[PDB]
Coordinates of C-alpha atoms and ligand atoms in Angstrom, one line a residue:
Chain L
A54 CA -94.8 -102.2 126.4
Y55 CA -95.7 -105.1 128.6
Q56 CA -98.1 -102.6 130.0
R57 CA -100.7 -103.4 127.4
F58 CA -100.2 -107.2 127.8
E59 CA -103.7 -108.9 128.0
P60 CA -103.4 -112.3 129.9
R61 CA -106.6 -113.7 128.4
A62 CA -105.5 -112.8 124.9
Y63 CA -102.2 -114.5 125.5
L64 CA -103.9 -117.6 126.9
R65 CA -106.2 -117.7 124.0
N66 CA -103.4 -117.4 121.5
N67 CA -101.1 -120.0 123.1
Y68 CA -103.2 -122.3 125.4
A69 CA -106.4 -122.7 123.5
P70 CA -106.8 -124.6 120.1
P71 CA -104.9 -125.2 117.9
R72 CA -101.7 -124.7 120.0
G73 CA -103.6 -125.8 123.1
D74 CA -105.1 -128.9 121.4
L75 CA -103.4 -131.6 123.4
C76 CA -105.1 -134.5 121.5
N77 CA -102.4 -134.8 118.9
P78 CA -99.2 -136.0 120.5
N79 CA -97.1 -134.3 117.8
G80 CA -98.2 -130.9 119.1
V81 CA -96.1 -128.4 121.1
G82 CA -98.1 -128.7 124.3
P83 CA -97.6 -132.4 124.7
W84 CA -94.0 -132.0 123.7
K85 CA -93.4 -129.5 126.5
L86 CA -95.2 -131.5 129.1
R87 CA -93.1 -134.6 128.1
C88 CA -89.9 -132.7 128.4
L89 CA -90.8 -131.6 131.9
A90 CA -92.2 -135.1 132.9
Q91 CA -89.2 -137.0 131.6
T92 CA -86.8 -134.7 133.4
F93 CA -88.4 -135.0 136.8
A94 CA -88.9 -138.8 136.4
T95 CA -85.1 -139.2 136.5
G96 CA -85.1 -138.4 140.2
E97 CA -82.1 -136.0 139.9
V98 CA -84.1 -132.8 140.2
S99 CA -85.3 -132.7 143.8
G100 CA -85.3 -130.5 146.8
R101 CA -87.5 -128.4 149.0
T102 CA -87.8 -125.1 147.2
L103 CA -88.5 -124.1 143.6
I104 CA -89.1 -120.8 141.9
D105 CA -90.9 -120.3 138.6
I106 CA -89.6 -117.2 136.9
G107 CA -92.0 -115.1 134.8
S108 CA -94.9 -117.6 135.2
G109 CA -97.3 -115.2 133.4
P110 CA -100.9 -116.5 133.8
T111 CA -99.9 -120.1 133.3
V112 CA -99.4 -123.2 135.5
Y113 CA -98.7 -126.1 133.1
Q114 CA -95.0 -125.6 133.7
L115 CA -95.3 -126.8 137.3
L116 CA -97.6 -129.8 136.9
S117 CA -94.8 -132.4 136.9
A118 CA -92.5 -130.3 139.1
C119 CA -94.9 -130.0 142.0
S120 CA -94.5 -133.6 143.3
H121 CA -90.8 -133.1 144.0
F122 CA -90.9 -129.7 145.7
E123 CA -93.0 -128.9 148.7
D124 CA -92.4 -125.1 148.7
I125 CA -93.1 -123.4 145.4
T126 CA -92.9 -119.7 144.5
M127 CA -94.5 -118.4 141.4
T128 CA -93.6 -115.0 140.0
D129 CA -94.4 -112.4 137.3
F130 CA -93.6 -108.8 136.4
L131 CA -97.3 -107.9 135.9
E132 CA -100.0 -107.6 138.5
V133 CA -102.7 -108.6 136.0
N134 CA -100.9 -112.0 135.6
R135 CA -100.3 -112.4 139.3
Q136 CA -104.0 -112.0 139.8
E137 CA -105.0 -114.3 137.0
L138 CA -102.8 -116.9 138.8
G139 CA -104.4 -116.2 142.1
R140 CA -107.7 -116.7 140.5
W141 CA -106.7 -120.2 139.6
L142 CA -104.8 -121.0 142.8
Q143 CA -107.9 -120.0 144.9
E144 CA -110.4 -121.7 142.6
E145 CA -112.2 -118.3 142.1
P146 CA -114.6 -117.4 139.3
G147 CA -113.3 -116.9 135.8
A148 CA -110.1 -118.8 136.4
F149 CA -108.5 -120.3 133.3
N150 CA -109.4 -124.0 132.8
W151 CA -106.1 -125.9 133.0
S152 CA -107.8 -129.3 133.5
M153 CA -106.7 -130.7 130.1
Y154 CA -103.1 -129.9 130.8
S155 CA -103.3 -131.6 134.2
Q156 CA -105.0 -134.6 132.6
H157 CA -102.2 -134.9 130.0
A158 CA -99.6 -134.5 132.6
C159 CA -101.2 -137.4 134.5
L160 CA -101.3 -139.5 131.4
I161 CA -97.7 -138.8 130.6
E162 CA -96.3 -139.5 134.0
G163 CA -97.9 -142.9 134.1
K164 CA -98.5 -143.3 137.9
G165 CA -102.3 -143.6 137.7
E166 CA -102.8 -140.2 139.2
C167 CA -106.1 -138.5 138.8
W168 CA -106.0 -134.9 137.5
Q169 CA -107.9 -133.4 140.4
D170 CA -105.3 -134.7 142.8
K171 CA -102.5 -133.2 140.7
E172 CA -104.2 -129.8 140.8
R173 CA -104.9 -130.1 144.5
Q174 CA -101.2 -130.8 145.1
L175 CA -100.0 -127.9 142.9
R176 CA -102.3 -125.5 144.6
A177 CA -101.1 -126.7 148.1
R178 CA -97.4 -126.5 147.4
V179 CA -97.5 -123.0 145.8
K180 CA -97.1 -120.7 148.9
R181 CA -96.7 -117.4 147.3
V182 CA -97.0 -115.4 144.1
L183 CA -94.4 -112.5 144.0
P184 CA -93.3 -109.6 141.8
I185 CA -90.1 -110.1 139.8
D186 CA -87.9 -108.2 137.3
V187 CA -85.1 -110.2 135.8
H188 CA -83.5 -107.0 134.6
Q189 CA -82.5 -106.4 138.2
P190 CA -79.4 -108.1 139.8
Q191 CA -81.8 -108.9 142.6
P192 CA -84.9 -110.0 140.6
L193 CA -86.9 -110.3 143.8
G194 CA -85.5 -107.4 145.8
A195 CA -83.9 -108.0 149.3
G196 CA -87.0 -108.1 151.5
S197 CA -88.0 -111.4 149.9
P198 CA -90.5 -113.8 151.3
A199 CA -88.9 -116.5 149.2
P200 CA -86.6 -119.1 150.6
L201 CA -83.1 -118.5 149.2
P202 CA -81.2 -119.9 147.6
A203 CA -83.6 -122.1 145.7
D204 CA -83.1 -125.8 145.0
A205 CA -84.4 -125.4 141.4
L206 CA -85.6 -122.8 138.9
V207 CA -88.2 -123.2 136.2
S208 CA -88.7 -120.6 133.4
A209 CA -90.8 -120.9 130.3
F210 CA -90.7 -118.3 127.6
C211 CA -89.5 -115.4 129.8
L212 CA -85.9 -114.4 129.1
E213 CA -86.0 -114.2 125.3
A214 CA -89.4 -112.5 125.6
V215 CA -88.1 -109.7 127.9
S216 CA -84.7 -109.1 126.2
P217 CA -84.1 -106.8 123.3
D218 CA -80.9 -108.6 122.3
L219 CA -78.6 -111.4 123.1
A220 CA -76.5 -109.6 125.7
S221 CA -79.5 -108.6 127.8
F222 CA -80.6 -112.2 127.5
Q223 CA -77.3 -113.3 129.0
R224 CA -77.5 -110.8 131.8
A225 CA -81.1 -111.7 132.6
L226 CA -79.9 -115.3 132.8
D227 CA -77.0 -114.3 135.2
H228 CA -79.5 -112.4 137.4
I229 CA -81.8 -115.4 137.9
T230 CA -78.9 -117.7 138.3
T231 CA -78.1 -115.9 141.6
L232 CA -81.4 -117.2 143.1
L233 CA -80.2 -120.7 142.6
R234 CA -77.9 -122.7 144.9
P235 CA -74.8 -124.3 143.5
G236 CA -75.6 -127.8 142.3
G237 CA -79.2 -126.7 141.8
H238 CA -81.2 -127.1 138.6
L239 CA -82.6 -124.8 136.0
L240 CA -85.4 -125.9 133.7
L241 CA -85.6 -123.5 130.8
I242 CA -88.2 -123.5 128.0
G243 CA -88.3 -121.0 125.2
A244 CA -89.1 -119.8 121.7
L245 CA -86.5 -120.3 118.9
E246 CA -85.8 -117.7 116.2
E247 CA -88.8 -115.6 117.3
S248 CA -88.8 -111.8 116.9
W249 CA -92.4 -110.9 118.0
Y250 CA -95.6 -112.2 119.5
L251 CA -99.0 -110.6 120.3
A252 CA -101.0 -110.4 123.5
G253 CA -104.1 -108.4 122.8
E254 CA -103.2 -104.8 122.2
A255 CA -99.6 -105.5 123.0
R256 CA -97.0 -106.4 120.4
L257 CA -93.8 -107.6 122.2
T258 CA -90.4 -107.7 120.7
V259 CA -88.4 -110.9 121.3
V260 CA -84.8 -111.6 120.6
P261 CA -84.4 -114.4 118.1
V262 CA -82.2 -117.1 119.6
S263 CA -80.8 -120.4 118.3
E264 CA -80.2 -123.6 120.2
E265 CA -76.4 -123.0 120.0
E266 CA -76.9 -119.5 121.5
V267 CA -79.0 -120.9 124.4
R268 CA -76.3 -123.5 125.1
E269 CA -73.4 -121.0 125.1
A270 CA -75.4 -118.6 127.2
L271 CA -76.0 -121.3 129.8
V272 CA -72.3 -122.2 130.0
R273 CA -71.2 -118.6 130.4
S274 CA -73.6 -118.3 133.3
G275 CA -72.0 -121.2 135.1
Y276 CA -74.1 -124.2 134.1
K277 CA -73.5 -127.7 132.9
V278 CA -76.1 -128.4 130.2
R279 CA -77.5 -131.8 131.1
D280 CA -80.0 -131.7 128.3
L281 CA -81.1 -129.4 125.5
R282 CA -83.6 -130.2 122.9
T283 CA -85.7 -128.6 120.2
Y284 CA -89.2 -128.9 118.7
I285 CA -89.7 -127.5 115.2
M286 CA -93.0 -125.6 114.8
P287 CA -95.2 -127.4 112.2
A288 CA -97.0 -125.3 109.7
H289 CA -100.5 -125.8 111.1
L290 CA -99.3 -124.3 114.3
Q291 CA -98.1 -121.1 112.6
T292 CA -101.1 -118.9 113.4
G293 CA -100.4 -115.2 113.1
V294 CA -99.9 -114.6 116.8
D295 CA -96.2 -114.8 116.5
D296 CA -93.3 -115.8 114.3
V297 CA -91.9 -118.6 116.4
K298 CA -89.9 -121.2 114.5
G299 CA -89.4 -123.8 117.2
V300 CA -89.3 -124.3 120.9
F301 CA -86.3 -125.3 123.0
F302 CA -86.1 -127.1 126.3
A303 CA -83.0 -126.9 128.5
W304 CA -82.1 -128.8 131.6
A305 CA -79.1 -127.2 133.2
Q306 CA -77.1 -127.7 136.5
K307 CA -75.2 -125.0 138.3
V308 CA -71.5 -126.1 138.9
Chain R
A21 CA -142.7 -166.1 134.5
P22 CA -144.8 -164.5 137.2
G23 CA -141.4 -163.6 138.7
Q24 CA -140.5 -161.8 135.5
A25 CA -143.8 -160.0 135.3
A26 CA -142.9 -158.4 138.7
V27 CA -139.5 -157.4 137.3
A28 CA -141.0 -155.7 134.2
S29 CA -143.5 -153.9 136.4
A30 CA -140.9 -152.8 138.9
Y31 CA -138.7 -151.4 136.1
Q32 CA -141.5 -149.2 134.9
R33 CA -140.5 -146.9 137.8
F34 CA -136.7 -147.0 136.9
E35 CA -135.3 -143.4 136.8
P36 CA -132.0 -143.1 134.8
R37 CA -130.8 -139.9 136.3
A38 CA -131.4 -141.2 139.8
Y39 CA -129.7 -144.4 139.0
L40 CA -126.7 -142.5 137.5
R41 CA -126.5 -140.2 140.5
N42 CA -126.6 -143.1 142.9
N43 CA -124.0 -145.2 141.2
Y44 CA -121.8 -143.0 138.8
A45 CA -121.6 -139.7 140.7
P46 CA -119.7 -139.3 144.0
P47 CA -118.9 -141.0 146.3
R48 CA -119.2 -144.2 144.2
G49 CA -118.3 -142.3 141.0
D50 CA -115.2 -140.9 142.7
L51 CA -112.4 -142.0 140.4
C52 CA -109.6 -140.5 142.5
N53 CA -109.6 -143.2 145.1
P54 CA -107.8 -146.1 143.4
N55 CA -109.4 -148.4 146.0
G56 CA -112.8 -147.4 144.9
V57 CA -115.1 -149.5 142.9
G58 CA -115.2 -147.4 139.7
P59 CA -111.5 -147.7 139.2
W60 CA -111.6 -151.4 140.1
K61 CA -114.2 -152.0 137.4
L62 CA -112.3 -150.0 134.7
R63 CA -109.1 -151.8 135.6
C64 CA -110.8 -155.2 135.2
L65 CA -111.9 -154.3 131.8
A66 CA -108.6 -152.6 130.8
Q67 CA -106.5 -155.6 132.0
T68 CA -108.6 -158.1 130.2
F69 CA -108.6 -156.3 126.9
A70 CA -104.8 -155.7 127.2
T71 CA -104.1 -159.4 126.8
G72 CA -105.3 -159.2 123.2
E73 CA -107.1 -162.5 123.8
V74 CA -110.5 -160.8 123.4
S75 CA -111.1 -159.3 120.0
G76 CA -113.2 -159.5 116.9
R77 CA -115.6 -157.7 114.7
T78 CA -118.8 -157.6 116.8
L79 CA -119.6 -157.0 120.4
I80 CA -122.9 -156.8 122.2
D81 CA -123.4 -155.0 125.5
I82 CA -126.3 -156.8 127.4
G83 CA -128.5 -154.5 129.5
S84 CA -126.5 -151.4 128.9
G85 CA -128.9 -149.2 130.9
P86 CA -128.0 -145.6 130.6
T87 CA -124.3 -146.3 130.9
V88 CA -121.3 -146.3 128.7
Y89 CA -118.2 -146.9 130.9
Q90 CA -118.3 -150.7 130.3
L91 CA -117.4 -150.2 126.6
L92 CA -114.6 -147.7 127.1
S93 CA -111.7 -150.2 126.9
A94 CA -113.6 -152.5 124.6
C95 CA -114.2 -150.2 121.7
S96 CA -110.5 -150.2 120.6
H97 CA -111.0 -153.9 120.0
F98 CA -114.3 -154.2 118.2
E99 CA -115.4 -152.3 115.1
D100 CA -119.2 -153.1 115.6
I101 CA -120.8 -152.5 118.9
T102 CA -124.5 -153.2 119.7
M103 CA -125.9 -151.5 122.9
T104 CA -129.1 -152.9 124.4
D105 CA -131.7 -152.2 127.0
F106 CA -135.2 -153.2 128.1
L107 CA -136.3 -149.6 128.8
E108 CA -136.9 -147.0 126.2
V109 CA -136.0 -144.2 128.7
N110 CA -132.5 -145.8 129.0
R111 CA -132.2 -146.2 125.3
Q112 CA -133.0 -142.5 125.0
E113 CA -130.4 -141.5 127.5
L114 CA -127.9 -143.4 125.3
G115 CA -129.3 -141.5 122.3
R116 CA -128.6 -138.2 124.1
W117 CA -125.1 -139.3 124.7
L118 CA -124.6 -140.5 121.2
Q119 CA -125.7 -137.1 120.0
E120 CA -123.2 -135.4 122.2
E121 CA -126.0 -133.3 123.8
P122 CA -125.3 -131.1 126.7
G123 CA -127.7 -132.3 129.3
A124 CA -126.6 -135.9 128.6
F125 CA -124.8 -137.5 131.4
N126 CA -121.1 -136.7 131.4
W127 CA -118.8 -139.7 131.2
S128 CA -115.6 -137.7 130.6
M129 CA -114.1 -138.6 134.1
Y130 CA -114.5 -142.3 133.2
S131 CA -113.2 -141.8 129.7
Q132 CA -110.1 -140.0 131.1
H133 CA -109.5 -142.6 133.7
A134 CA -109.8 -145.3 131.1
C135 CA -107.2 -143.4 129.0
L136 CA -105.0 -143.2 132.1
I137 CA -105.2 -146.9 132.8
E138 CA -104.7 -148.2 129.3
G139 CA -101.3 -146.3 129.2
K140 CA -101.3 -145.5 125.5
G141 CA -101.4 -141.7 126.0
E142 CA -104.8 -141.4 124.4
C143 CA -106.9 -138.4 125.2
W144 CA -110.4 -138.8 126.4
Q145 CA -112.0 -136.9 123.5
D146 CA -110.6 -139.4 121.0
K147 CA -111.8 -142.3 123.2
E148 CA -115.4 -141.0 123.2
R149 CA -115.3 -140.2 119.5
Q150 CA -114.2 -143.7 118.7
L151 CA -116.9 -145.2 121.0
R152 CA -119.7 -143.1 119.4
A153 CA -118.5 -144.2 116.0
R154 CA -118.3 -147.9 116.8
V155 CA -121.8 -148.1 118.4
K156 CA -123.8 -149.2 115.4
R157 CA -127.2 -149.6 117.1
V158 CA -129.1 -149.4 120.3
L159 CA -131.7 -152.2 120.7
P160 CA -134.5 -153.4 122.9
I161 CA -133.6 -156.6 124.7
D162 CA -135.3 -159.0 127.1
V163 CA -133.0 -161.6 128.6
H164 CA -135.9 -163.8 129.8
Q165 CA -136.8 -164.6 126.2
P166 CA -135.2 -167.5 124.5
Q167 CA -134.3 -165.0 121.7
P168 CA -133.4 -161.9 123.8
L169 CA -133.2 -159.6 120.8
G170 CA -136.2 -161.0 119.1
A171 CA -136.5 -163.0 115.8
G172 CA -135.3 -160.9 112.8
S173 CA -132.9 -158.8 114.8
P174 CA -130.7 -156.2 113.1
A175 CA -127.8 -157.4 115.3
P176 CA -125.0 -159.3 113.6
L177 CA -125.2 -162.8 115.1
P178 CA -123.5 -164.7 116.4
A179 CA -121.4 -162.1 118.2
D180 CA -117.6 -162.4 118.9
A181 CA -118.0 -161.1 122.5
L182 CA -120.6 -160.0 125.1
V183 CA -120.3 -157.5 127.9
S184 CA -122.9 -157.3 130.6
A185 CA -122.6 -155.2 133.7
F186 CA -125.1 -155.4 136.6
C187 CA -127.9 -156.8 134.4
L188 CA -128.6 -160.5 135.0
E189 CA -128.8 -160.5 138.7
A190 CA -130.7 -157.3 138.7
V191 CA -133.6 -158.6 136.6
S192 CA -133.7 -162.2 137.9
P193 CA -136.1 -162.9 140.8
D194 CA -134.2 -166.2 141.6
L195 CA -131.1 -168.2 140.7
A196 CA -132.9 -170.5 138.2
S197 CA -134.0 -167.4 136.4
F198 CA -130.4 -166.1 136.5
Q199 CA -129.2 -169.4 135.0
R200 CA -131.8 -169.3 132.2
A201 CA -131.0 -165.7 131.3
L202 CA -127.4 -166.6 131.1
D203 CA -128.2 -169.5 128.8
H204 CA -130.4 -167.2 126.7
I205 CA -127.6 -164.5 126.2
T206 CA -125.1 -167.3 125.5
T207 CA -127.0 -168.2 122.3
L208 CA -125.9 -164.7 121.0
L209 CA -122.3 -165.5 121.3
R210 CA -120.2 -167.6 118.9
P211 CA -118.4 -170.7 120.3
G212 CA -114.8 -169.7 121.3
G213 CA -116.3 -166.2 122.1
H214 CA -115.8 -164.2 125.2
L215 CA -118.2 -162.9 128.0
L216 CA -117.2 -160.2 130.4
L217 CA -119.6 -160.1 133.2
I218 CA -119.7 -157.6 136.0
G219 CA -122.2 -157.8 138.8
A220 CA -123.3 -157.3 142.4
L221 CA -122.6 -159.9 145.1
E222 CA -125.2 -160.7 147.9
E223 CA -127.5 -157.9 147.0
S224 CA -131.3 -158.1 147.4
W225 CA -132.2 -154.5 146.5
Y226 CA -131.2 -151.2 145.0
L227 CA -132.8 -147.8 144.4
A228 CA -133.4 -146.0 141.1
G229 CA -135.4 -142.9 142.2
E230 CA -139.0 -143.9 143.1
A231 CA -138.2 -147.5 142.2
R232 CA -136.8 -149.9 144.8
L233 CA -135.9 -153.1 142.8
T234 CA -135.7 -156.6 144.1
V235 CA -132.8 -158.6 143.0
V236 CA -131.4 -162.1 143.6
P237 CA -128.4 -162.2 146.0
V238 CA -125.7 -164.3 144.4
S239 CA -122.3 -165.5 145.6
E240 CA -119.1 -165.9 143.6
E241 CA -119.7 -169.7 143.8
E242 CA -123.1 -169.4 142.2
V243 CA -121.8 -167.1 139.5
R244 CA -119.1 -169.6 138.7
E245 CA -121.4 -172.7 138.6
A246 CA -123.8 -170.8 136.3
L247 CA -121.0 -170.0 133.9
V248 CA -119.9 -173.6 133.8
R249 CA -123.5 -174.9 133.4
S250 CA -123.9 -172.5 130.5
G251 CA -120.9 -174.0 128.7
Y252 CA -118.1 -171.6 129.6
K253 CA -114.6 -172.0 130.7
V254 CA -113.9 -169.5 133.4
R255 CA -110.6 -167.6 132.7
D256 CA -110.9 -165.1 135.5
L257 CA -113.3 -164.4 138.3
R258 CA -112.5 -161.5 140.6
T259 CA -114.2 -160.1 143.7
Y260 CA -114.2 -156.6 145.1
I261 CA -115.5 -156.1 148.7
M262 CA -117.5 -153.0 149.1
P263 CA -116.0 -150.7 151.8
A264 CA -118.2 -149.2 154.5
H265 CA -117.7 -145.7 153.2
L266 CA -119.4 -146.8 149.9
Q267 CA -122.3 -148.4 151.7
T268 CA -124.7 -145.4 151.3
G269 CA -128.2 -146.7 151.4
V270 CA -128.8 -146.9 147.6
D271 CA -128.5 -150.7 147.9
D272 CA -127.4 -153.5 150.2
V273 CA -124.6 -154.7 148.0
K274 CA -121.7 -156.5 149.7
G275 CA -119.3 -156.8 146.8
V276 CA -118.8 -156.8 143.0
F277 CA -117.7 -159.6 140.8
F278 CA -115.9 -159.5 137.5
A279 CA -116.0 -162.7 135.4
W280 CA -114.1 -163.4 132.2
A281 CA -115.4 -166.6 130.5
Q282 CA -115.0 -168.2 127.1
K283 CA -117.7 -170.2 125.5
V284 CA -116.5 -173.8 124.7
Ligands
LIG289 N1 -88.8 -107.6 133.3 C1 -89.4 -108.8 133.5 N2 -89.0 -109.7 134.4 C2 -89.6 -110.9 134.6 N3 -90.7 -111.2 133.9 C3 -91.2 -110.3 132.9 C4 -90.6 -109.1 132.7 N4 -91.3 -108.4 131.7 C5 -92.3 -109.2 131.3 N5 -92.3 -110.4 132.0 C6 -93.2 -111.5 131.9 O1 -92.7 -112.5 131.0 C7 -93.9 -113.2 130.7 C8 -93.8 -113.8 129.3 S1 -95.2 -114.8 128.8 C9 -94.3 -115.7 127.4 C10 -94.5 -115.3 126.0 C11 -93.6 -115.8 124.8 N6 -94.1 -115.6 123.5 C12 -94.3 -116.6 122.5 O2 -94.8 -116.3 121.4 C13 -94.0 -118.0 122.8 C14 -95.1 -118.6 123.6 C15 -95.4 -120.0 123.4 C16 -96.0 -120.7 124.4 C17 -96.2 -122.1 124.2 C18 -96.0 -122.7 123.1 C19 -95.4 -121.9 122.0 C20 -95.2 -120.6 122.1 C21 -94.6 -119.8 121.0 N7 -93.7 -118.7 121.5 C22 -95.0 -112.3 130.9 O3 -96.0 -112.9 131.8 C23 -94.5 -111.1 131.3 O4 -95.3 -110.4 132.4
LIG290 N1 -135.6 -158.2 131.1 C1 -134.5 -157.5 130.9 N2 -133.6 -157.9 130.0 C2 -132.4 -157.1 129.9 N3 -132.2 -156.1 130.5 C3 -133.2 -155.6 131.5 C4 -134.3 -156.4 131.7 N4 -135.1 -155.7 132.7 C5 -134.5 -154.6 133.1 N5 -133.3 -154.6 132.4 C6 -132.3 -153.6 132.5 O1 -131.3 -154.0 133.4 C7 -130.6 -152.8 133.7 C8 -130.1 -152.9 135.1 S1 -129.0 -151.5 135.5 C9 -128.9 -151.5 137.3 C10 -128.5 -152.7 138.1 C11 -127.4 -152.4 139.2 N6 -127.4 -152.7 140.6 C12 -126.5 -152.2 141.5 O2 -126.6 -152.5 142.7 C13 -125.3 -151.3 141.1 C14 -124.1 -151.7 142.0 C15 -122.9 -151.0 141.6 C16 -121.9 -151.1 142.5 C17 -120.7 -150.5 142.2 C18 -120.5 -149.9 141.1 C19 -121.5 -149.9 140.1 C20 -122.7 -150.4 140.4 C21 -123.7 -150.4 139.3 N7 -125.1 -151.1 139.7 C22 -131.6 -151.7 133.5 O3 -131.0 -150.9 132.6 C23 -132.8 -152.4 133.1 O4 -133.5 -151.6 132.1

């Protein structure tokens, strides 16, 4: 099913206008970047190693993260996404243009940083791009190039999007939780009350979750929820590429 | 007056794109190095406008050339902007940019960096859009004339504020000429009005393609005395010393000054 997933279609649907229009601050893109930026600016999420779970073809979710972790592992289930990443990490031709997201991240963080430096830094600190399957109790396998356990995890729009129901969502969460050291941090972004989205020829089933469900799922996996918030999807961002109602952002800490 | 006939003649070889490349592309156009001159200039303008002490309806940019960066912070504070230059080829380059033509020089790195410094979370596309909207006219100017815009000028006079970057010292064969050109533009500004003046220190030449232009070297002391003689109180006068890495053979500039002055 994910076997028909078109990276460029997905990027077009979610990271080009209107949803990728970062000029309005009331949009979902600026909201997400702000969540991430505010969270790292507290100083409490730090360490040497970080893993991004189910990164798809996207990088925005590490823009703020990358100044606090010197070893970054990105991951996805699909080769075609791994290679779309690689195209961007290696500044190859036909890479997706993330420059506006980098620019807005610089603007939000407020340190005077130029966006080319931020990209440079992200590209430098991402050492590897590995396969992953969160449906496995060892999402990475055993012969894993990745430093384990990790100091922090980031995951945006993966678990709900690869899980037919709540229970599989819970298990997938337990599975990635093993990659993270005790005391470590999980940064989790996702769709609320969504049941499908499109990516070219692919129509993906999603489990609709509520904020309450996400919270309880986090507790039951062994986390303290340091923060959990919601963005309600305005009407002009309801575009026929999915049925998302809102987006959640969770900051959680392993006990 | 002979001196200014030489200036006019010399400018007839002025090539915008060469001038842009020399001064507003890398390494001088490198906005990543905060210790660079581009950021220093944007910071001077941002910090001055962020006091709120400089505001009004009308602003005039004196000797804009083919450049736009010097209005990026200002345009949030003035609803009517006049841009000006001696050369048609520069005025046309402005035209291209006003029309959002591809093939126009790209000021997006400057617009972004200005957005970054001002700290209001503005995106650069909106900044540019606002600038294009607030620029109400692009006019011939000659600062050596007692009426630099001419007699029945379109321009709303007197203006609430003037900006001038790298003009007066670049078109004046000597200090006395510099002084008079200053007095001339000062007639365009209302009393109580503000002048933001950026310029080269101790430079005697720069290159604009074919053209190698003679300019009067001035010091900070000279700039300050001239402002005083023209009837200004100096609120701020800052100096940037050009690092060796930015001394590239496009001019013999030693530093840059930023002056904020208010007309008595
Ligand atoms: N078994 C698996 N293990 C790990 N990862 C897997 C996997 N199967 C598929 N994946 C990957 O998960 C990524 C999911 S991309 C996320 C799509 C979520 N769908 C949406 O409709 C969101 C996306 C979105 C994004 C930004 C702002 C708003 C919205 C609205 N809702 C893809 O790259 C797969 O290869
Ligand atoms: N008679 C006249 N009245 C008014 N404007 C006139 C004029 N004759 C010529 N102009 C215009 O003056 C402008 C002068 S622009 C160039 C002068 C700059 N010299 C420099 O050396 C560098 C130096 C520098 C250094 C660091 C960062 C930026 C810069 C920018 N300029 C041109 O557009 C003329 O058409």
